[PDB]
Amino acid sequence: SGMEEWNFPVEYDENYLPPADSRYWFPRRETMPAAERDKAILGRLQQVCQYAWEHAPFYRRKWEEAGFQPSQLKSLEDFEARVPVVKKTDLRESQAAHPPFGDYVCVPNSEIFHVHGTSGTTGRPTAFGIGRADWRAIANAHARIMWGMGIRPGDLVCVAAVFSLYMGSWGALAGAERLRAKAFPFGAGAPGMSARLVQWLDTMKPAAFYGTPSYAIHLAEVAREEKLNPRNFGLKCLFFSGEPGASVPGVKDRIEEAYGAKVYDCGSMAEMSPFMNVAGTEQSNDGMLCWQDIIYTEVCDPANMRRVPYGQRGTPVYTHLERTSQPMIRLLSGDLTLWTNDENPCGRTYPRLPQGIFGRIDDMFTIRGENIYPSEIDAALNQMSGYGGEHRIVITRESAMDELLLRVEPSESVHAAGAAALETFRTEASHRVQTVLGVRAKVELVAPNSIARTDKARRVIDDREVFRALNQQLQSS
Amino acid sequence: SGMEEWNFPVEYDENYLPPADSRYWFPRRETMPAAERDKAILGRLQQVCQYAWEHAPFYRRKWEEAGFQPSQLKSLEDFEARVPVVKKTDLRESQAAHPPFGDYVCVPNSEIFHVHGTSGTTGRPTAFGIGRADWRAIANAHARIMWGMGIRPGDLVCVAAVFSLYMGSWGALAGAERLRAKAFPFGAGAPGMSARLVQWLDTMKPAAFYGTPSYAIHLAEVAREEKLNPRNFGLKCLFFSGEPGASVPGVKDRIEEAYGAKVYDCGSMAEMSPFMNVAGTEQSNDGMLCWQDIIYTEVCDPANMRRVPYGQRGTPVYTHLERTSQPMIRLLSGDLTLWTNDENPCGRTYPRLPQGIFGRIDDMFTIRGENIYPSEIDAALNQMSGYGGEHRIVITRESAMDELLLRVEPSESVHAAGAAALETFRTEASHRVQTVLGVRAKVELVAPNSIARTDKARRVIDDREVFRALNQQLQSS
Numbered sequence: 029s030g031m032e033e034w035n036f037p038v039e040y041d042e043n044y045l046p047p048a049d050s051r052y053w054f055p056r057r058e059t060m061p062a063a064e065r066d067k068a069i070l071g072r073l074q075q076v077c078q079y080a081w082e083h084a085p086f087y088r089r090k091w092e093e094a095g096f097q098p099s100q101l102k103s104l105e106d107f108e109a110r111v112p113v114v115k116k117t118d119l120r121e122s123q124a125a126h127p128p129f130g131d132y133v134c135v136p137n138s139e140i141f142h143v144h145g146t147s148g149t150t151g152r153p154t155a156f157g158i159g160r161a162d163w164r165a166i167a168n169a170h171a172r173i174m175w176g177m178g179i180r181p182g183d184l185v186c187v188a189a190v191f192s193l194y195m196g197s198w199g200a201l202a203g204a205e206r207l208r209a210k211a212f213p214f215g216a217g218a219p220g221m222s223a224r225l226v227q228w229l230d231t232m233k234p235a236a237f238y239g240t241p242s243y244a245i246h247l248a249e250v251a252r253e254e255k256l257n258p259r260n261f262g263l264k265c266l267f268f269s270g271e272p273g274a275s276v277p278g279v280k281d282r283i284e285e286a287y288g289a290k291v292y293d294c295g296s297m298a299e300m301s302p303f304m305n306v307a308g309t310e311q312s313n314d315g316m317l318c319w320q321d322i323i324y325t326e327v328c329d330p331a332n333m334r335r336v337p338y339g340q341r342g343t344p345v346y347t348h349l350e351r352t353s354q355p356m357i358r359l360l361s362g363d364l365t366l367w368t369n370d371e372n373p374c375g376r377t378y379p380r381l382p383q384g385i386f387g388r389i390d391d392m393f394t395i396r397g398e399n400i401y402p403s404e405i406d407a408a409l410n411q412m413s414g415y416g417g418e419h420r421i422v423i424t425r426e427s428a429m430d431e432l433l434l435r436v437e438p439s440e441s442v443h444a445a446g447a448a449a450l451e452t453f454r455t456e457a458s459h460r461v462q463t464v465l466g467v468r469a470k471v472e473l474v475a476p477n478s479i480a481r482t483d484k485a486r487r488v489i490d491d492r493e494v495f496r497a498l499n500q501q502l503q504s505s
Numbered sequence: 506s507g508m509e510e511w512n513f514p515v516e517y518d519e520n521y522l523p524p525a526d527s528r529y530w531f532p533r534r535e536t537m538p539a540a541e542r543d544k545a546i547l548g549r550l551q552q553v554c555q556y557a558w559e560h561a562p563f564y565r566r567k568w569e570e571a572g573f574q575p576s577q578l579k580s581l582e583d584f585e586a587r588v589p590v591v592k593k594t595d596l597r598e599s600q601a602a603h604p605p606f607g608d609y610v611c612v613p614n615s616e617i618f619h620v621h622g623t624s625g626t627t628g629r630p631t632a633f634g635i636g637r638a639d640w641r642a643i644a645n646a647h648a649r650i651m652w653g654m655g656i657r658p659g660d661l662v663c664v665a666a667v668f669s670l671y672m673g674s675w676g677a678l679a680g681a682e683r684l685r686a687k688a689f690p691f692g693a694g695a696p697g698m699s700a701r702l703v704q705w706l707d708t709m710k711p712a713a714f715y716g717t718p719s720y721a722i723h724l725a726e727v728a729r730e731e732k733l734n735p736r737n738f739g740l741k742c743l744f745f746s747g748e749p750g751a752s753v754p755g756v757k758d759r760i761e762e763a764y765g766a767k768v769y770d771c772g773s774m775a776e777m778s779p780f781m782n783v784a785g786t787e788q789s790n791d792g793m794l795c796w797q798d799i800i801y802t803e804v805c806d807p808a809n810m811r812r813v814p815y816g817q818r819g820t821p822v823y824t825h826l827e828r829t830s831q832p833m834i835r836l837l838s839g840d841l842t843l844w845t846n847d848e849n850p851c852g853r854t855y856p857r858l859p860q861g862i863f864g865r866i867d868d869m870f871t872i873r874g875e876n877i878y879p880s881e882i883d884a885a886l887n888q889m890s891g892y893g894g895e896h897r898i899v900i901t902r903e904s905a906m907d908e909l910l911l912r913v914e915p916s917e918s919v920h921a922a923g924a925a926a927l928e929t930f931r932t933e934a935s936h937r938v939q940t941v942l943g944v945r946a947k948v949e950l951v952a953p954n955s956i957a958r959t960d961k962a963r964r965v966i967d968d969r970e971v972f973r974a975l976n977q978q979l980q981s982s
């Protein structure tokens with residue numbers, strides 16, 4: 029095949045840096061005939077499915093009840109048709125039965141290097157247990173993809189996303205470290221951090237910046253209040269993940285204008301680290317490329333989980349080709365995208381997402397880069413005695429970043445107990461909701477029976493102008 | 506000497522794990538006769554001074570004006586008497602002239618791996634540029650010291666300190682990673698993080714925890730409001746840095762009681778990463794050991810910068826023995842400590858700080874693990890037109906963590922312009938002070954000429970009961 033350092037389990041040369049003239053970090057893997065890479069991906073899929081069958085009782089159970097065995101994997105058509113999709117709810121149930129990391133972890137406990145996770149659910153939150161070898165594989169894949177964006181060794185890379193449970197910032201960091209770039213992990217989340225960060229960007233003048241697209245808009249506003257020019261931060265490129273925006277003109281163009289630098293979209297899911305497997309390149313700067321030999325992406329018809337033709341829309345379904353810990357095999361994203369397989373300006377022979385990722389097959393939405401499930405807001409409110417049985421969700425972006433508004437009904441008893449009791453229920457609901465979601469929601473009370481009861485109810489209003497036209501087009505096609 | 510992996514520049518075996526029965530990660534370095542290690546430290550000091558002379562115009566300039574050359578370094582007595590101490594203000598001036606990392610950086614730009622830094626000063630803040638090889642040296646030294654605390658491979662290690670500019674959390678992380686412990690970088694600083702963290706500690710039940718001592722007290726209070734038992738977090742040990750507390754009975758004992766686990770003190774300075782060079786051990790659990798072959802600590806008489814005898818108090822002065830990037834040679838801490846050189850319960854032949862570190866030779870104080878210079882609060886306020894020329898500083902710890910209160914005079918003109926103008930000056934002073942300090946200060950206004958003018962003024966009142974007796978004893982001896 030000629031594919032660079034192509035084996036499972038993967039074990040990249042940590043000293044490899046491509047020649048300075050090279051556009052591609054791995055010229056063969058990135059430009060080889062797609063049909064040839066597809067033969068190699070099938071070969072890999074077979075090893076990964078065999079590996080999961082032997083080390084993941086989660087997959088053995090799932091595949092047995094679907095009537096699938098690794099011996100039945102003969103083509104990519106067998107892969108889409110026979111292998112059932114994994115849902116995030118299955119992953120959550122596996123961990124409830126086999127904590128801390130489910131019976132899909134595969135690796136022994138002694139191999140676990142970092143513990144990360146997610147927020148958003150009531151009950152026990154899901155944990156990520158990333159093996160030592162997978163951390164190196166993620167670092168190596170991200171450095172390759174960041175090289176694709178024009179980021180080079182020695183470049184100062186500002187990671188201005190929270191360093192906590194979430195894989196986003198850790199992935200951009202691990203990528204910067206492997207690239208021999210000067211990683212600058214400023215982080216995020218403490219009120220006051222933005223005013224200090226703009227001083228550090230004016231002083232350090234990094235070549236690259238990573239965060240959420242809306243945070244970069246917020247930071248431009250902060251730099252101006254701080255009497256700083258964001259055009260003088262020395263930025264060559266900004267790359268974002270966590271939410272839609274970097275492939276949306278009314279978002280991307282405002283960032284390119286504020287900073288005078290190119291913006292790159294990247295990012296699938298945290299369960300899919302290396303999450304930059306979907307990422308734009310310096311020449312293919314609009315939307316994202318599907319880096320198929322790192323993670324195998326299939327854009328699927330959600331009714332049958334089969335690949336849609338190119339030029340068509342569907343839901344991304346992902347498979348780890350280079351992970352031994354918690355490998356995801358056909359994980360259903362639930363997102364929507366249009367994929368195409370035309371000639372890319374950068375020369376990479378990868379499928380493309382020309383407008384990035386937008387929209388969902390379910391009722392999930394994002395608030396400041398955080399996934400929000402309305403069923404989870406409903407479960408959190410129903411755990412409260414003072415809850416009056418009904419609520420409404422209003423999403424706005426009146427300033428640079430999202431605001432989540434909850435209009436909650438108090439019980440009649442709480443309302444009768446007076447203004448003090450009412451205010452106590454509101455603050456307790458806000459505390460409970462924030463602990464569950466991982467983000468601050470704004471909570472307001474309405475009259476005890478003022479909201480309509482529709483016994484499934486559609487409680488969410490997405491009032492974000494920047495996504496309105498995109499939400500209407502999902503209703504046209 | 507028999508000293509394990511003893512060379513400069515250092516290059517540790519990344520695959521080395523000590524035998525499971527071993528108390529010491531490096532038995533020879535940790536238990537060898539002190540006089541023999543001292544001969545080796547002199548040998549190292551000579552290489553480090555020669556290395557700085559060739560690669561740091563900062564040190565060449567400093568030593569020339571002090572009348573010192575590496576050829577004059579023949580004994581540890583020559584080291585204390587001839588080599589002038591480095592002050593943090595010199596480091597700040599070197600960076601103003603030779604940004605980004607001063608002319609003490611030594612390594613070429615291509616070697617820089619991580620950019621960190623500090624807060625606390627008006628103007629350009631000081632940056633840390635840590636080389637790739639030094640990051641490995643820090644990871645390796647911290648894993649050795651964490652092994653000394655009884656932390657073992659496979660142990661889940663919760664790092665509940667902010668992941669941003671500060672070296673603290675990064676150092677505990679790098680240490681956990683090298684130790685083959687399961688690093689759990691939860692982080693800190695976003696309001697709401699504590700309520701979620703206690704859920705994660707109840708669920709993940711880590712063996713070890715890292716943060717500030719007061720944060721662990723705050724977190725115990727949060728676990729109780731969250732209806733959780735902090736005694737059921739599975740903790741074996743908590744290790745802290747950033748502020749005094751882990752060697753103070755009225756602090757340490759409340760933590761040991763709340764969690765039912767041993768507490769370890771550690772931490773010198775962020776400029777001195779690996780900062781755990783001063784750290785307690787599982788058997789020498791009270792106070793800290795000076796791990797002399799990692800960083801050379803000298804407890805000095807601040808009038809002449811010469812070592813005080815054992816049993817006496819002085820200021821720690823530190824020297825990097827295993828750093829090529831920004832190596833610190835005789836950096837004056839300005840802190841106070843009592844050092845002793847008696848037989849240690851763990852068997853380590855190191856000098857000991859039996860009561861940790863407490864007190865300063867200057868007016869610096871700590872607020873929630875953050876260094877605060879009153880001269881810097883004065884400089885920040887004098888940049889404001891609405892400032893009335895005077896203020897007072899009140900430090901309290903009424904709840905689990907410090908509160909910094911500023912009583913600020915508005916100008917007569919601002920006071921005459923009314924309640925609106927007054928409130929505008931207060932909010933702007935609070936914003937300016939927080940941006941400078943890196944921590945939220947509480948700002949209250951007083952009458953335009955109500956504060957006494959003493960043309961140097963002593964504006965700070967440390968009203969923290971937990972440090973009162975210790976502050977009085979510094980006045981006795």
Ligand SMILES: CC(C)(COP(=O)(O)OP(=O)(O)OC[C@H]1O[C@@H](n2cnc3c(N)ncnc32)[C@H](O)[C@@H]1OP(=O)(O)O)[C@@H](O)C(=O)NCCC(=O)NCCS
Nearest residue numbers: 189196216217219220222239240270396397398467468695
């Ligand atoms: C960052 C985070 C911890 C803040 O918590 P929160 O409830 O949203 O907090 P608030 O809205 O009250 O904002 C607190 C501060 O965090 C900042 N902030 C909010 N969302 C942020 C984000 N996604 N990235 C960076 N900073 C963010 C705010 O601007 C504010 O600081 P400032 O007023 O000094 O500017 C939270 O949004 C989060 O965990 N997001 C994770 C999603 C994510 O970023 N994933 C994608 C990886 S790029």
Ligand SMILES: CC(C)(COP(=O)(O)OP(=O)(O)OC[C@H]1O[C@@H](n2cnc3c(N)ncnc32)[C@H](O)[C@@H]1OP(=O)(O)O)[C@@H](O)C(=O)NCCC(=O)NCCS
Nearest residue numbers: 218666673693694696697699716717747873874875944945
């Ligand atoms: C963590 C930090 C960013 C918070 O900023 P701040 O101005 O102090 O913020 P606030 O006092 O308004 O507190 C905001 C939240 O951070 C938490 N917090 C405050 N100081 C903290 C600390 N040192 N460690 C962890 N969390 C901390 C608060 O408890 C609060 O969360 P909660 O109400 O949900 O519990 C700040 O204190 C800091 O940068 N400290 C660095 C010093 C340090 O920790 N160094 C030693 C390494 S161990």
Ligand SMILES: CC(C)(O)C(=O)OP(=O)(O)OC[C@H]1O[C@@H](n2cnc3c(N)ncnc32)[C@H](O)[C@@H]1O
Nearest residue numbers: 196269270271272294295296297298299303385
């Ligand atoms: C991608 C990452 C690691 O930053 C992340 O947020 O992971 P997470 O698993 O928490 O959430 C993934 C979901 O957020 C949304 N999302 C993430 N990145 C993008 C993106 N770049 N564009 C459009 N939506 C995105 C998608 O709906 C996706 O299903």
Ligand SMILES: CC(C)(O)C(=O)OP(=O)(O)OC[C@H]1O[C@@H](n2cnc3c(N)ncnc32)[C@H](O)[C@@H]1O
Nearest residue numbers: 673746747748749771772773774775776780862
């Ligand atoms: C040690 C570290 C990396 O956490 C840190 O805070 O580094 P920094 O350079 O910012 O500040 C060091 C100062 O904080 C105080 N400090 C840090 N750790 C301790 C400690 N363990 N005990 C008593 N004081 C401490 C000392 O006064 C010291 O001078």
